[PDB]
Design a protein around this ligand. Structure first.
Ligand SMILES: [Mg+2]
Ligand SMILES: [Mg+2]
Ligand SMILES: [Zn+2]
Length: 859
């Protein structure tokens, strides 16, 4: 097991050593010019200064350590254990350590991952090291405040491309060398190698030229849209260079779509890796292009927030992720075609922030992270989305100019170095010309949400006689009220002699503080028909509406002209549903009747997923099975049939039908789309392409309509013959596990929780099939099996890989007091490690929320 580095251990090591350079020499061949299969050779030379006479440890996870030396004295490696690294005893002032090892390839997305493409037999490698998996590829002091230069050399099969952080030098006789990097952290070192297809372009401005590359597997090249990605890339560099002062510091900029990736992307300096789902093989909506552009711009923002300046320790991961999230959405809004990015943020990412902040594991943005175990579960909706939301509010509070000026100072001060909370706040304080210590304490060091509401009286002509914004204390948390810069918007009719649309007819900006903030400027103003006290989504809060405004919202959501205020209403309704203030069936009604007016297909997609959570988790289950699901499925098919042919909305409604709980009529309709012209089904212009076929096959498998005679799967196997790709095989694995047969669920469950050799990406696909909609009664036995299995999975697999089972197989379907008690009994053992307890507490809290919602929906 790799070492669980503690905050205290990291501080202790950084007080003793300062690293200059690494030289990393890799051989990823089999020693005969072909790709290696199990291990690769890694020979690392590190130069570092030390307090003379101290001891340290160099980290390394290897199959074999062949030799290790300190200042050319050979070390005894006969007792080598990856948990202990290699001890370095009696350090000199100036040191050279060499470690020559055979390291293991990964098939679980941590370390140097190896994949074989079934289409062409080609091998592809990529690295992934955040947080502390660099030690699986090279010996190092694996912590982010021990920066160093990197000089990488790789021996590879002759036909391969080889990409690292640095620009390539000409390769010779299998050997690829790279330009030495600037000083950076070990978790950012990259290796991507194999017969990847390439595209090239260049970004040019007054600062100079950045060579751009895009890479993907050869078998996916026909699907690449490199011009669109290069356009977005260049828009990003133009925006960041306009605002951040220091230009991009890491040379060239390669973007590599890699197989079996665990996350969405990773900001390795000069060598950003991506989930290869972003190479679209089939038709996707604008939602997918917009999310991919956000990801491109997020990784690029990290070239400043994480790569140029890095947090000292993982408690300040928000310095990377809150800022990268905020900056990427700002850049998307202002520099790209995705001009509604703040609308998408308010519906998609803020909903994630609220869910995370309300769990019993809620933690401040500036977190307390005692060890690696704690950070490996902290890449979450607070570190990302709440932090970005709170930074958006800081920009409202001090203004964008002072905010950006403070960041430009921060970058210049800490360039190629490390920063903590106190360093960031010092820079923003200097630039803002005011004390932000109280602001930081109440916003960055707290948990929870403040509820914001209008409180007013009106005269007989509907004009305010008094208006305030009321603010609840933070919950869950320490109950404080905060300072907010926010806007009050009043919405009313735009029509000539007509209702027409609800448009903004009055706006007031104000400084809100404490429980009640009077708004004198609204005395004598018409109350209109809908009041929003977080207009333009400037602050992080729980928004609620006065009675009349809420009735207007529930009746006229489709009349709100502008996407952002319409999203503020969708979000308030969804949050009221989560909070047992709006019945599940009323939220489903609202979406079913209003989504035709939601022009932003990304927002519409999220509303349909919410409606599906409402039906599957929040609604009285008898009503959901007998009425709610079949009505929602019928509405999706009506919506699809009324949509424009070939449109994004047409596809979204059919995608949602494929993930719903189906009646026999819906099963017939979807099966007909596999065999026939879609026009015959009233769906002219719908492309029943490779991935929509798989979504339909998975729906038919889930419904018991195909391969229902026994565990054999001739129909799904025929679909793999049609699409015999790594993607088709993972979709097939999902579809086979989705079938409502106990023996199929049991075989899949046992495979994924037992077989440590199974690729994590395949496991995940099987888990998505196990936990299929509508199957909660069938899956009840797997609740106890889950609680009995997860300690072993957590002990055998890394946190990130174990999470596939711990998060993905939590029994969210067992919505009962017995299900709550099952988690309580697991949690009653005080020796369960804190990160595993956290994930079970979160699962238990989601089921508790579902029970409270079902009681509200029934009554
Ligand atoms: Mg071939
Ligand atoms: Mg990781
Ligand atoms: Zn990030």
């Amino acid at each position: 097991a790799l070492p669980n580095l503690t905050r205290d251990q990291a501080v202790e090591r950084a007080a003793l050593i300062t690293v200059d350079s690494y030289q990393i020499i890799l051989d990823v061949t089999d020693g005969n010019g072909a790709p290696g299969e199990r291990t690769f050779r890694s020979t690392t030379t590190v130069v570092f200064d030390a307090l003379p006479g101290a001891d340290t440890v160099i980290d390394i996870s290897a199959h074999t350590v062949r030799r290790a030396s300190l200042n050319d004295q050979d070390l005894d490696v006969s007792g080598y254990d990856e948990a202990a690294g290699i001890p370095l005893r009696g350090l000199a002032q100036r040191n050279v350590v060499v470690v020559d090892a055979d390291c293991h390839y990964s098939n679980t997305g941590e370390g140097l991952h190896r994949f074989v493409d079934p289409v062409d037999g080609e091998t592809y490698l990529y690295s992934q090291f955040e947080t502390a998996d660099a030690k699986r590829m090279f010996a190092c002091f694996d912590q982010p405040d021990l920066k160093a230069t990197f000089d990488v050399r790789v021996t590879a099969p002759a036909h391969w491309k080889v990409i690292s952080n640095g620009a390539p030098l000409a390769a010779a006789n299998g050997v690829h060398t790279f330009a030495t990097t600037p000083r950076m952290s070990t978790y950012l070192v990259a290796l991507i190698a194999g017969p990847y297809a390439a595209w090239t372009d260049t970004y040019i401005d007054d600062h100079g030229e950045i060579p751009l590359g895009i890479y993907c597997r050869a078998s996916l090249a026909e699907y690449m849209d490199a011009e669109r990605l290069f356009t977005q890339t260049k828009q990003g560099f133009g925006f960041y260079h306009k605002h951040f002062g220091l230009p991009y510091a890491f040379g060239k900029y390669d973007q590599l779509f890699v197989p079996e990736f665990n996350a969405g992307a990773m900001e390795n300096a000069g060598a950003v890796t991506f989930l290869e789902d972003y190479v679209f093989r089939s038709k996707v909506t604008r939602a997918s292009y917009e999310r991919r552009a956000e990801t491109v711009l997020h990784e690029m923002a990290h070239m400043w927030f994480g790569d140029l300046v890095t947090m000292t320790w993982w408690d300040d991961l928000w310095l990377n992720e809150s800022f990268a999230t905020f900056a990427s959405v700002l850049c998307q809004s202002e520099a790209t075609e995705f001009t509604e990015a703040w609308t998408t943020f308010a519906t998609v990412e803020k909903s994630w922030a609220y869910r995370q902040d309300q769990l019993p594991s809620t933690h401040p943005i500036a977190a307390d992270i005692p060890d690696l175990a704690a950070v490996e579960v902290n890449f979450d909706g607070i570190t990302y989305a709440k932090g970005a939301s709170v930074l958006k509010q800081l920009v409202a509070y001090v203004g964008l100019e002072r905010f950006l000026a403070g960041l430009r100072d921060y970058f210049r001060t800490h360039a190629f170095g490390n920063a903590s909370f106190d360093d960031l706040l010092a820079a923003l304080e200097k630039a803002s010309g005011r004390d932000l210590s109280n602001w930081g304490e109440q916003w960055l060091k707290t948990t929870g949400l403040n509820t914001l509401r209008p409180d007013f009286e009106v005269d007989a002509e509907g004009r305010f006689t008094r208006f305030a914004v009321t603010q609840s204390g933070a919950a869950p948390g320490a109950g404080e009220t905060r300072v907010h810069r926010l806007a009050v918007g009043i919405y009313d009719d735009d029509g000539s002699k007509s209702s027409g649309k609800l448009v903004r007819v009055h706006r007031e900006e104000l400084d809100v503080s404490g429980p009640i903030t009077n708004v004198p400027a609204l005395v004598g103003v018409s109350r209109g028909k809908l009041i929003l006290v977080n207009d333009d989504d400037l602050t992080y809060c729980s928004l609620r509406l006065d009675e009349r405004s809420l009735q207007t919202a529930l009746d006229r959501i489709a009349d709100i002209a502008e996407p952002l205020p319409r999203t503020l209403v969708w979000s308030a309704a969804w949050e009221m549903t989560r909070e047992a203030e709006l019945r599940a069936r009323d939220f489903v009604s609202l979406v079913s009747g209003g989504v035709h007016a939601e022009t932003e297909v990304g927002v519409a997609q999220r509303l349909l997923l919410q409606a599906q959570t409402a039906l599957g988790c929040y609604a009285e289950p008898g009503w959901a099975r007998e009425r709610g699901w079949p009505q929602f499925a019928d509405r999706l098919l009506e919506l699809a049939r009324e949509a424009e042919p070939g449109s994004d909305h047409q596809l979204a409604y059919i995608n949602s039908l494929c993930s719903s709980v189906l009646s026999p009529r819906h099963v017939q309709t979807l099966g007909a789309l596999l065999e026939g012209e879609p026009a015959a089904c009233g769906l002219a212009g719908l492309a029943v392409d490779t991935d929509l076929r798989w979504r339909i096959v998975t729906a038919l498998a889930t419904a018991g309509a195909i391969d229902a005679d026994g565990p054999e799967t001739p129909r799904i196997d025929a679909e793999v013959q049609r699409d015999p790709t790594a993607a088709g095989k993972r979709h097939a694995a999902q579809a086979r596990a989705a079938r409502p047969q106990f023996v199929v669920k049991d075989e899949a469950f046992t495979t994924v929780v037992e077989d440590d050799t199974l690729a994590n990406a395949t496991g995940r696909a099987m888990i998505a099939g196990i936990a299929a909609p509508g199957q909660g009664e069938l899956l009840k036995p797997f609740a106890r099996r889950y609680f009995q299995a997860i300690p072993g999975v957590w002990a055998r697999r890394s946190s990130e890989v174990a999470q596939s089972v711990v998060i993905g197989l939590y029994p969210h379907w067992d919505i009962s007091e017995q299900g709550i008690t099952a988690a309580e009994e697991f949690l009653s053992d005080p020796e369960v490690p804190p990160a595993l307890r956290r994930l079970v507490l979160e699962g238990q809290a989601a089921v508790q929320r579902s029970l409270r919602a079902r009681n509200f929906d029934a009554d």
